Amino acid sequence: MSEESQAFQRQLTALIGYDVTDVSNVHDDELEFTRRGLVTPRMAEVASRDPKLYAMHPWVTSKPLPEYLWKKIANNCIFIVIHRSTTSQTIKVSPDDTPGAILQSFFTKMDFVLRVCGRDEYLVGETPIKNFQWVRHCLKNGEEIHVVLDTPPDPALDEVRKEVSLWDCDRKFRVKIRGIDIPVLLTVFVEANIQHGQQVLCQRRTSPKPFTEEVLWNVWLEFSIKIKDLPKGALLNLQIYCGRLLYYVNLLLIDHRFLLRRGEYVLHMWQISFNADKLTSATNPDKENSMSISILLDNYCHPIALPKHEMPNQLRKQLEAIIATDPLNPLTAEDKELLWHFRYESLKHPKAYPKLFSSVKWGQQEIVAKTYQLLARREVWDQSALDVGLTMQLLDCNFSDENVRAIAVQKLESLEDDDVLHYLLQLVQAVKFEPYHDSALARFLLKRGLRNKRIGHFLFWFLRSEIAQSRHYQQRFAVILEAYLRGCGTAMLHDFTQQVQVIEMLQKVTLDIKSLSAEKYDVSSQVISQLKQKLENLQNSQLPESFRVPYDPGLKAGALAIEKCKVMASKKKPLWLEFKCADPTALSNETIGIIFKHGDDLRQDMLILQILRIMESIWETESLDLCLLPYGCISTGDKIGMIEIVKDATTIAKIQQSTVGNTGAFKDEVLNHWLKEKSPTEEKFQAAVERFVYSCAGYCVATFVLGIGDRHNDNIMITETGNLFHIDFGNKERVPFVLTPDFLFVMGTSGKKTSPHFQKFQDICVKAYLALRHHTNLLIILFSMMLMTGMPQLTSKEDIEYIRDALTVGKNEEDAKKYFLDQIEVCRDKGWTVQFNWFLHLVLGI
Numbered sequence: 001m002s003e004e005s006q007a008f009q010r011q012l013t014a015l016i017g018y019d020v021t022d023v024s025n026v027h028d029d030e031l032e033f034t035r036r037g038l039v040t041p042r043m044a045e046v047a048s049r050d051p052k053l054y055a056m057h058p059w060v061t062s063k064p065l066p067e068y069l070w071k072k073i074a075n076n077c078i079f080i081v082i083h084r085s086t087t088s089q090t091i092k093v094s095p096d097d098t099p100g101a102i103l104q105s106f107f108t109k110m111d112f113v114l115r116v117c118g119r120d121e122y123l124v125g126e127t128p129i130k131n132f133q134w135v136r137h138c139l140k141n142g143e144e145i146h147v148v149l150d151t152p153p154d155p156a157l158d159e160v161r162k163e164v165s166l167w168d169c170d171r172k173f174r175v176k177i178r179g180i181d182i183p184v185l186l187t188v189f190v191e192a193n194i195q196h197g198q199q200v201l202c203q204r205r206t207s208p209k210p211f212t213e214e215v216l217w218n219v220w221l222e223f224s225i226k227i228k229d230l231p232k233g234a235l236l237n238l239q240i241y242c243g244r245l246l247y248y249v250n251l252l253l254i255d256h257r258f259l260l261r262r263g264e265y266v267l268h269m270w271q272i273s274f275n276a277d278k279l280t281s282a283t284n285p286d287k288e289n290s291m292s293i294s295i296l297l298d299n300y301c302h303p304i305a306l307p308k309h310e311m312p313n314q315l316r317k318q319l320e321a322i323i324a325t326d327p328l329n330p331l332t333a334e335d336k337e338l339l340w341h342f343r344y345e346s347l348k349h350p351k352a353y354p355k356l357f358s359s360v361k362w363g364q365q366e367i368v369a370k371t372y373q374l375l376a377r378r379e380v381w382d383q384s385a386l387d388v389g390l391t392m393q394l395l396d397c398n399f400s401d402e403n404v405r406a407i408a409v410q411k412l413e414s415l416e417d418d419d420v421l422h423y424l425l426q427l428v429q430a431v432k433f434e435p436y437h438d439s440a441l442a443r444f445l446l447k448r449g450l451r452n453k454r455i456g457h458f459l460f461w462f463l464r465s466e467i468a469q470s471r472h473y474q475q476r477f478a479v480i481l482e483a484y485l486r487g488c489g490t491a492m493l494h495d496f497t498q499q500v501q502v503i504e505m506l507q508k509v510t511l512d513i514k515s516l517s518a519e520k521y522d523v524s525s526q527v528i529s530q531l532k533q534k535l536e537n538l539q540n541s542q543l544p545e546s547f548r549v550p551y552d553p554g555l556k557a558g559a560l561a562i563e564k565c566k567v568m569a570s571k572k573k574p575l576w577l578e579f580k581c582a583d584p585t586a587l588s589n590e591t592i593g594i595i596f597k598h599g600d601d602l603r604q605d606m607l608i609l610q611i612l613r614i615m616e617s618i619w620e621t622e623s624l625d626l627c628l629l630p631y632g633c634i635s636t637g638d639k640i641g642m643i644e645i646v647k648d649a650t651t652i653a654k655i656q657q658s659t660v661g662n663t664g665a666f667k668d669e670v671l672n673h674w675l676k677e678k679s680p681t682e683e684k685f686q687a688a689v690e691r692f693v694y695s696c697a698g699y700c701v702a703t704f705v706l707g708i709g710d711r712h713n714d715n716i717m718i719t720e721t722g723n724l725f726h727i728d729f730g731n732k733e734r735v736p737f738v739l740t741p742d743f744l745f746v747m748g749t750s751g752k753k754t755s756p757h758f759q760k761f762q763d764i765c766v767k768a769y770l771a772l773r774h775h776t777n778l779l780i781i782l783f784s785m786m787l788m789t790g791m792p793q794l795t796s797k798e799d800i801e802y803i804r805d806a807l808t809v810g811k812n813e814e815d816a817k818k819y820f821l822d823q824i825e826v827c828r829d830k831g832w833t834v835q836f837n838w839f840l841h842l843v844l845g846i
């Protein structure tokens with residue numbers, strides 16, 4: 001423990017935002033055991049990754065070139081403008097070529113690597129040039145592929161620092177509820193529940209006594225279950241109801257060492273303000289204001305859970321009907337008993353696993369043991385093609401068993417980096433449903449991070465996001481981050497530092513300029529100086545030379561641009577900031593637009609934004625583009641965070657506020673005028689018109705399904721290139737989504753007719769809607785996880801099921817294609833009704 005090793009920990013604690021050495025809010029050594037446990041996966045992956053490739057973090061995909069991309073290349077040859085000092089020449093390179101093929105056969109026509117100008121993206125590795133993500137991004141936006149001919153980054157910069165019984169106890173389980181002690185204030189009773197994967201097994205209560213600062217009981221709660229029957233994962237959930245639920249706390253009956261919990265406990269509970277926070281094994285660190293629960297566990301010696309070593313056609317059809325059901329459709333006892341009985345038969349269908357392992361009676365050891373027998377042989381699931389939507393299901397709050405969950409993590413392993421990045425956020429979030437800190441999932445994330453800088457970059461911010469504002473899961477998440485920062489490399493270790501410094505500094509300002517204004521949502525004149533002033537105050541010798549853009553790790557942001565910085569006219573007062581690109585190779589003077597806001601939980605914007613990236617790739621599988629704009633959004637604090645800025649993009653409302661004004665006399669021709677006027681060449685007007693139809697279709701569908709299509713006119717934007725997109729995702733009038741008359745005007749149907757564009761629109765919709773329905777289960781699980789992992793409010797069964805109706809489950813496919821168009825019609829039959837109401841509701845406060 002050198003003085004040097006004692007400062008490093010002081011450092012990490014800063015890059016994490018929580019000190020993983022604060023045994024002040026723990027009743028055991030699980031976290032510590034976990035840090036000690038992650039030391040191997042970390043080092044193992046660290047001392048196993050190719051230093052060269054890792055240094056350049058190539059970004060590729062094995063997926064086939066989409067229809068629109070493939071069917072767009074000039075026959076079988078493309079062009080990549082190569083750069084150097086100042087010189088540059090264009091080369092004809094086939095799609096199936098490789099970085100090795102080029103550069104080498106190129107070197108002999110006039111020992112070095114190809115890097116994208118302005119970015120930290122090198123095109124290296126033995127992979128088809130077409131397989132490179134960045135390149136696909138070029139073709140997509142129809143752009144040239146310029147790259148500087150420079151030397152490979154020194155792989156030595158990623159250096160890493162110097163690194164007694166069993167089932168022989170048939171006595172019923174009991175717990176002594178000594179009392180509850182609350183510092184400062186009808187009746188109140190304690191409710192102990194033996195839980196397992198949100199599945200309540202046994203439950204007891206205490207005599208309703210008077211609610212005072214201290215309410216004793218010293219009453220033993222005898223359950224009906226048995227010690228031998230307690231499953232590895234069983235959780236002791238303690239709750240307090242009034243004379244409704246008020247305080248809840250949990251305690252894992254079986255610990256990380258497979259040992260039965262025992263002794264005295266004075267756990268500090270959480271107070272209610274269903275979701276993943278009620279599942280936490282952590283205690284409230286606020287020992288001064290939090291309710292306390294004193295309990296006692298029977299005194300013994302040391303019991304330990306040992307680590308275990310043809311049908312009627314009418315029934316077949318009945319089983320099948322159960323297996324081919326959506327994730328949200330429950331199971332009757334008949335169902336479960338049916339599923340169980342036919343274990344092995346239900347084992348031949350991967351799609352049956354979630355439903356199958358939910359029919360298990362985990363409150364019975366003999367059964368659980370049998371279950372472990374079923375997992376002993378699963379060639380079907382093991383050989384079946386990976387199904388994320390299926391894999392994800394086994395990772396939610398419905399499966400507290402590590403053996404079951406570990407089979408999903410096993411499937412995840414198959415996923416290439418590209419895919420890991422698509423689901424990273426939800427996976428990270430899925431750690432909340434893990435009954436123990438050290439878990440197969442936690443490790444997978446760690447490995448995949450230390451394995452790839454990209455994944456590693458994002459893993460950091462996702463994890464950090466939670467640690468900052470989540471008292472319920474910060475610890476576990478903090479220990480998982482520490483394990484990552486200790487193997488990613490001094491290089492990244494330094495990038496993260498630079499990144500954190502900037503952020504923290506900018507948050508200071510963001511919240512500073514916020515106080516200097518209340519109900520006056522009008523940016524004062526003397527406040528414009530306050531901002532410009534403080535900004536330069538940092539440029540002096542504070543703001544690092546050039547941090548890296550969190551939502552875009554490839555981008556290096558240099559010095560600011562105080563001149564172009566301001567404070568949006570929002571009743572919250574965000575911070576519009578522009579940055580110069582630190583990379584002098586970027587063939588553009590164009591700045592970097594980043595926003596900093598407070599008041600809205602950007603964690604929700606994140607989830608919703610990532611789902612959008614999902615829907616875009618989901619369509620790519622069906623060869624379909626919708627031009628969505630899932631701009632970058634990274635959370636960092638409670639109601640703080642940063643956001644990317646789309647260039648040349650205006651509010652749809654503002655485009656109306658121009659031609660019209662401070663009224664609701666919305667005119668249809670407005671929008672269509674904006675495009676043609678903004679886009680000079682008659683050609684660009686034509687193209688901008690197409691983008692809109694596609695972008696509008698894309699967002700119309702996605703927003704509907706997510707249940708966030710009916711939003712004010714202010715929450716929707718558009719670009720001088722026709723691309724449209726939504727924003728700020730953080731007894732009356734309603735609507736599926738937004739398809740206002742000004743929109744349809746650009747399609748060719750001012751009134752209620754049709755056109756060669758509106759039919760294009762409708763056709764694209766269903767072609768997109770039916771595509772997402774193909775992945776009904778995936779979207780249901782994600783949406784379901786997003787709600788209980790991201791949406792604070794105690795998500796109800798009713799809220800989650802909205803996704804079912806939206807995707808029209810059960811209903812035939814034919815009725816679907818029609819169901820959507822019907823929704824479109826609902827919009828036409830409302831013109832500016834819903835919108836006009838939002839104006840009267842918001843702009844007039846009614």
Ligand SMILES: CC1(C)CC(=O)c2sc(N3CCOCC3)nc2C1
Nearest residue numbers: 570574631644645646649727728729
């Ligand atoms: C304050 C505000 C409404 C909150 C929010 O979520 C977004 S998202 C956004 N976009 C991002 C893309 O570039 C244009 C602006 N502005 C804002 C501003």
